[PDB]
Structures are given as structure tokens and as C-alpha cells.
């Protein structure tokens, strides 16, 4: 399975479609660190968020594990860093790649999903209190993105 | 496979057995080879007596295993 | 986590066959004694004890997501994405080992022309051959 | 549907040990209660009456299957 | 130095050992944490069983080494 991970790393280092930079750490190809830039037209703009990725030994037969090391303010992102994502939970397919999941994460950051929130407080604030959501997201980005 | 049975003073005999063979079958083979009835045979392996109702794999008996016969 | 399946590496302890047989007899007595056990077994164990053949459907219970990937390889597409061969790599207590599903399985590359047999061999090895002796002892103990 | 061997203190999720958690939801009270199995999370609306809560929970658990 | 001991699926533990100590010392140090008597613990490394008489130096043990622990299946 190491060959697939090497191919994914080569693709990411060659032409990473997502606005992110990820690579193996600790001389281990199964453990990766990734950086996601803050998308424009959003309070996260100008912030970089750090994520930790664990590749199962059965990759690509098993979805990778993704956690948000950097604190973020998002209804669908847990404070501790846990994430909710269908492609990593039930819709995972071997055809999927690290770049695809990174693009999905970037999109989810661009368009939150209050309909299936892991933090109802933030979901309600974003839905009915857009100004508060923007302000709090900006503060959290300034504090924990740079 | 084959196992070996040795007495305190007598020689060593060879018995062709399988893991599913019960200790009763081992005693029957011993009787066939030497004539000793099963009731007069006591089998010991690793210092532990062997019961009739169990098999070889139960006591971790393998090929070329050596057993002690006491009458 | 609640349900368990027999361990392939049980061979480390020479007595593992006898202990599997003991587990079989105690389970049989529990059924006879009508004492429910919170323990559970993978679908493979139930199918084998009932005598039914084991297939990828049992593999679903053991590895739900991985079974999904296997079935997706078999039918949902033409795979040809991974360079996996007809062999399985395992780490037995720090010792890396490779087991060939079929003769020369290490070198033969998995392709769409041999994926149908590849998946069948993989599931058969995972469920039955890897546990042949242990499960036979368990079954004879139960019966 | 299987409780952990030790009990409900042994509840585990994708990331490891994770106890059952109930979280308030301010959405419309008509919203059916939602759940996230990845962390044993249950987002529940504050139903005014016990009968309404029981009906909503029954509907959710039945529609789950 | 320090070494790591891990079970098949349970947690991992750390011991403070040195190359000269026999496997008896390692088993005893395991006992203080979990309580398994040395006669019941089976320690393995690199897929080869260990012995009480030998020591870490005999098994070319080094820093940040991971051993595997099993519970004895007494035969009788």
C-alpha cells in the first residue's frame, strides 16, 4: 500500500489542486501534516489552519483519519479538532485521494453545513447571527491561524 | 505422525497416531502391540497424567513426543 | 469491539488449539445451560459452525469499510489503480512476513483480468485458511 | 446495538473512548432529533412536553432503520 | 535507557531498563504496573521468543524498542 501513498505524495508535491501544503512527518509516510489556507470572501481569509492526517495501513481501502490541530470556529468542526465528513465516514472509495479530501475540506470551510452540525451553538449563530459568526471566526483566525 | 512410549525399565515403542486420536486409542494401540490392557496402563507426559477422554492435541502432544508408561 | 474473531497468530502459544477446543466446549455448555453470553462472533464463525460457506458477505461484518472497497474493486469499476499482488503483508509481533494467496502470488499483479479470483482468494484466506486449524478445534470442541 | 463489555463508561468512537453526549439544539422544535455516531453525539431539541419528546425520539430511532 | 512494551490491542507501557539486566528484571518491572507474575508473561521481540536467562544486550535491544506482551497458556 506504500506505493499508493508515494503516488499521492508525488501528486501533491507536483500539482496540488487544493490551496494546501501537506507531507509526511517523522520519516513516516502514514503520518502527515497539512496546511489549509483561509479562503477569500470569508472570515477565515488570511488564516492558515494546521491538520493532522493518519493513513490506515489498508489505504486506500480505508478512509484516512483527519483532525484539526488548529483551533477553528465552525459548526461542523469540533473544538478538539474532530471533523464530520461523509467521504471519510461512509462514502469513502479507493478511487478517492488525499487531494480530493483536502479539496472537500476546503469547500466545507467555504460553505458550512448547519443542517448537520457538530456544534449546534455555532450553527445557530451562523444561521441567524451572521455578524457574530463572522466576528468570532475572525477573532479565532487571528488568534490561532497565524 | 509418530510418537514414542517408554517404560521405566523396558524399551521404547513407536505408535502412529493423529491429533484426533484419543488417549483411549493410544492405550488400545499399546495393548495391541504389547498386550497390556488399557486399565493397567498409566500415561504421563511433562509430569502430567493423561486422561482417556482427551486427545493428543489437548496435552500439546506432537510428532516424536515421548510419553512415560507406568503400570 | 464487542464481537471477536479467532486470532491468526494464536500459534505463538503451542497450546492454542486445546484452548480453542475448550472455548468450544464451554460455549456449547453455555448454550445447553441457557446462560446468555455478551460475547459475539463475526459472521464467519456463525456460518462455519452452521456449515454454511463463508464469502464476502461475512467479510462485510469483519471489515465493513474494507469490504466496501473490495466490492467496489470487484464490480463498481475496473480498478487497475493499485499495484497490489496476490499476497498479504503482515506484521507478526514486529516480524514482517508475506503470505502468498496462490503459488507465485507475490509476483503476479492484480488486474481486472484476475480480480474476480483475487478477491475470492483474499476472502477465503482471511476467513477460513488463516484460521483452519484453530476453527476446526473450536468446532470439534463445540460439537 | 451492543453496549461495551465493561459498560457505558467504555463507549468508544472513531478517535477512541468517547462517552454518550447530549447537546441542545435551538432549531425548530419540529426538527427530528439528530445524531452523529462518529462521537456518540445526540443533538436534541428542547421539547416542551414529554409526550412530544417521546414521539420525536421514537420517530427518529424507527426511521434510523 | 527506556523501552516500550505493548499488548496485542491494549495500551502501551514504558520501562526504564539497561542492556545488562536480564529479562527477569523486565518482567518484574512489567509486574509492578499490570501485576502479571513473571511466570505468566511471555515477551517477544522481532517475532522471536525471549528467555529469562538472557538480557537486553544478548537480544541486541536498543533505545525506543517495542516489545510484545502475551499471557501464558499453561498446558498441564
Amino acid at each position: 500500500a506504500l506505493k499508493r501513498i508515494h503516488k499521492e505524495l508525488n501528486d501533491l508535491a507536483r500539482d496540488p489542486p487544493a490551496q494546501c501544503s501537506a507531507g509526511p512527518v517523522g520519516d513516516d509516510m502514514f503520518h502527515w501534516q497539512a496546511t489549509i489556507m483561509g479562503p477569500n470572501d470569508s472570515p477565515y481569509q488570511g488564516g492558515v489552519f494546521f491538520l493532522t492526517i493518519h493513513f490506515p495501513t489498508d489505504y486506500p481501502f480505508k478512509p484516512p483519519k483527519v483532525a484539526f490541530t488548529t483551533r477553528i470556529y465552525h459548526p461542523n468542526i469540533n473544538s478538539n479538532g474532530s471533523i464530520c465528513l461523509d467521504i471519510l465516514r461512509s462514502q469513502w472509495s479507493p478511487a478517492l485521494t488525499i487531494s480530493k479530501v483536502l479539496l472537500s475540506i476546503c469547500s466545507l470551510l467555504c460553505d458550512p453545513n448547519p443542517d448537520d452540525p457538530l456544534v449546534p451553538e455555532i450553527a445557530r449563530i451562523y444561521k441567524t447571527d451572521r455578524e457574530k459568526y463572522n466576528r468570532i471566526a475572525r477573532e479565532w483566525t487571528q488568534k490561532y491561524a497565524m | 505422525m509418530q510418537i514414542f512410549v517408554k517404560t521405566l525399565t523396558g524399551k521404547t515403542i513407536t505408535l502412529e497416531v493423529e491429533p484426533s486420536d484419543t488417549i483411549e486409542n493410544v492405550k488400545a494401540k499399546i495393548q495391541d502391540k504389547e498386550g497390556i490392557p488399557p486399565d493397567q496402563q498409566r500415561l504421563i507426559f511433562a509430569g502430567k497424567q493423561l486422561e482417556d477422554g482427551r486427545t493428543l492435541s489437548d496435552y500439546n502432544i506432537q510428532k516424536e513426543s515421548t510419553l512415560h508408561l507406568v503400570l | 469491539k464487542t464481537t471477536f474473531h479467532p486470532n491468526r497468530t494464536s500459534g505463538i502459544n503451542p497450546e492454542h488449539l486445546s484452548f480453542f477446543k475448550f472455548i468450544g466446549m464451554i460455549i456449547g455448555k453455555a448454550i445447553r445451560d441457557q446462560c446468555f453470553l455478551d460475547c459475539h462472533f463475526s459472521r464467519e464463525v456463525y456460518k462455519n459452525i452452521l456449515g454454511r460457506p463463508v464469502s464476502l458477505k461475512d467479510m462485510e461484518s469483519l471489515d465493513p469499510d474494507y469490504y466496501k472497497s473490495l466490492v467496489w474493486i470487484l464490480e463498481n469499476d475496473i480498478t487497475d489503480i493499485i499495484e497490489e499482488t496476490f499476497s498479504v503483508e503482515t506484521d507478526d509481533y514486529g516480524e514482517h512476513k508475506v503470505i502468498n494467496l496462490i503459488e507465485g502470488g507475490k509476483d503476479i499483479i492484480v488486474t481486472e483480468a484476475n480480480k474476480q479470483d483475487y478477491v475470492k482468494k483474499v476472502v477465503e484466506y482471511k476467513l477460513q485458511t488463516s484460521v483452519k486449524e484453530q476453527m476446526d478445534n473450536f468446532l470439534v470442541g463445540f460439537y | 446495538s451492543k453496549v461495551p463489555l465493561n459498560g457505558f463508561k467504555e463507549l468508544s468512537g472513531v478517535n477512541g473512548v468517547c462517552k454518550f453526549s447530549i447537546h441542545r439544539d435551538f432549531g425548530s422544535s419540529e426538527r427530528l432529533p439528530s445524531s452523529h455516531t462518529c462521537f456518540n453525539q445526540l443533538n436534541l431539541p428542547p421539547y416542551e412536553s414529554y409526550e412530544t419528546l417521546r414521539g420525536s425520539l421514537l420517530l427518529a430511532i424507527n426511521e434510523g432503520h
Side-chain angles (χ1 to χ4, degrees), chain A, chain B residues 1-10 12-15 17-23 25-47 49-62 64-71, chain C, chain D:
Chain A
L2 284 83
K3 55 230 178 282
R4 189 69 186 262
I5 313 199
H6 291 55
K7 286 194 290 297
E8 306 336 308
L9 177 52
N10 189 359
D11 305 340
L12 273 172
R14 175 197 326 127
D15 44 9
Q19 319 311 334
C20 62
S21 300
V25 195
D27 278 330
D28 181 7
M29 273 285 242
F30 289 8
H31 181 63
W32 282 36
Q33 192 277 349
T35 64
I36 310 304
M37 73 74 241
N40 55 42
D41 197 343
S42 176
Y44 327 122
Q45 173 48 36
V48 59
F49 310 91
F50 303 158
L51 292 70
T52 179
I53 331 298
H54 272 129
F55 272 115
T57 184
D58 277 33
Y59 193 86
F61 304 160
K62 301 296 301 211
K65 283 84 78 207
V66 188
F68 257 62
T69 63
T70 282
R71 299 165 31 69
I72 201 158
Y73 193 66
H74 202 287
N76 312 79
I77 306 303
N78 184 9
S79 35
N80 89 317
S82 95
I83 306 142
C84 287
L85 178 45
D86 311 354
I87 67 144
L88 291 177
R89 292 277 182 272
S90 34
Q91 196 263 357
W92 171 254
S93 155
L96 300 183
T97 65
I98 187 68
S99 66
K100 290 167 175 181
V101 55
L102 292 160
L103 293 154
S104 62
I105 290 289
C106 287
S107 75
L108 201 163
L109 252 175
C110 288
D111 39 325
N113 172 19
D115 314 336
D116 182 20
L118 188 43
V119 187
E121 307 293 329
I122 308 180
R124 220 70 54 197
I125 287 154
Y126 169 48
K127 168 155 60 48
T128 317
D129 317 88
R130 282 287 298 97
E131 77 296 1
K132 318 183 49 35
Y133 186 63
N134 267 355
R135 184 170 39 68
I136 299 159
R138 284 174 182 286
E139 276 110 34
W140 284 41
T141 288
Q142 300 348 296
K143 292 166 174 171
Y144 327 107
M146 329 327 159
Chain B
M1 59 312 273
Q2 74 186 6
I3 53 169
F4 285 60
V5 187
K6 172 244 187 187
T7 52
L8 179 59
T9 54
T12 307
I13 56 173
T14 310
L15 306 170
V17 296
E18 267 309 273
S20 62
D21 285 280
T22 188
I23 301 302
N25 283 333
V26 173
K27 285 178 174 180
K29 294 164 190 285
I30 290 162
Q31 181 184 39
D32 307 346
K33 285 197 81 72
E34 314 298 274
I36 303 164
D39 55 12
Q40 286 172 18
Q41 305 173 33
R42 210 60 41 81
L43 264 291
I44 298 160
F45 182 41
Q49 205 171 119
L50 310 196
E51 146 183 55
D52 295 345
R54 298 302 187 187
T55 74
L56 320 182
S57 65
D58 293 349
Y59 298 100
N60 196 21
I61 283 160
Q62 64 286 5
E64 294 70 84
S65 284
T66 307
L67 321 169
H68 301 329
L69 174 60
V70 179
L71 315 169
Chain C
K1 204 84 80 205
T2 315
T3 190
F4 329 91
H5 68 86
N7 195 10
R8 152 165 31 70
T9 61
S10 84
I12 57 176
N13 304 138
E15 299 72 17
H16 62 117
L17 305 314
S18 55
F19 277 88
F20 278 114
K21 214 192 305 313
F22 171 58
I23 283 165
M25 32 213 92
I26 183 47
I27 290 272
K29 188 76 165 48
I31 280 158
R32 289 184 67 82
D33 208 356
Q34 307 218 136
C35 178
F36 285 115
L37 306 191
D38 51 23
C39 61
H40 283 108
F41 308 147
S42 46
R43 295 288 301 289
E44 52 159 15
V45 174
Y46 291 130
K47 276 216 172 70
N48 280 318
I49 184 162
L50 293 181
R52 218 146 286 100
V54 304
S55 83
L56 75 175
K57 299 309 307 311
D58 300 281
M59 186 63 268
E60 156 51 24
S61 76
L62 211 176
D63 286 359
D65 190 295
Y66 157 87
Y67 160 91
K68 212 286 297 294
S69 289
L70 268 178
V71 62
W72 169 98
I73 290 162
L74 189 54
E75 326 188 352
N76 291 347
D77 71 297
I78 204 78
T79 165
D80 310 347
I81 77 197
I82 186 62
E83 326 309 334
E84 175 61 13
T85 55
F86 286 65
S87 68
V88 186
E89 301 163 48
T90 186
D91 187 5
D92 187 30
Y93 307 118
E95 150 165 273
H96 194 294
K97 176 155 44 161
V98 184
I99 305 111
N100 291 38
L101 304 163
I102 49 174
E103 177 49 284
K106 264 211 80 175
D107 322 324
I108 174 161
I109 194 74
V110 172
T111 76
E112 81 308 338
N114 50 9
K115 60 173 166 157
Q116 76 298 52
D117 58 52
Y118 163 69
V119 300
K120 291 173 178 181
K121 277 281 160 197
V122 164
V123 62
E124 167 58 13
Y125 154 62
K126 287 285 197 314
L127 303 179
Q128 202 64 28
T129 85
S130 178
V131 197
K132 170 51 56 166
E133 51 271 23
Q134 307 102 314
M135 249 289 273
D136 295 358
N137 302 127
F138 171 40
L139 267 170
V140 63
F142 182 100
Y143 291 133
Chain D
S1 291
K2 311 182 174 62
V3 303
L5 296 175
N6 301 61
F8 277 92
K9 84 204 75 146
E10 241 65 5
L11 291 160
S12 63
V14 301
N15 64 325
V17 178
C18 182
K19 325 204 94 172
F20 176 46
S21 98
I22 316 193
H23 290 228
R24 164 188 303 271
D25 154 79
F26 313 81
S28 175
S29 65
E30 294 80 347
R31 156 165 290 150
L32 201 68
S34 66
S35 63
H36 317 325
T37 52
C38 18
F39 330 94
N40 314 1
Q41 154 77 272
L42 164 51
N43 299 343
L44 178 68
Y47 290 107
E48 78 302 337
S49 80
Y50 159 77
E51 275 69 6
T52 48
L53 188 141
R54 188 168 198 285
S56 310
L57 191 60
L58 257 288
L59 282 167
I61 63 183
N62 297 305
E63 289 182 34
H65 273 271

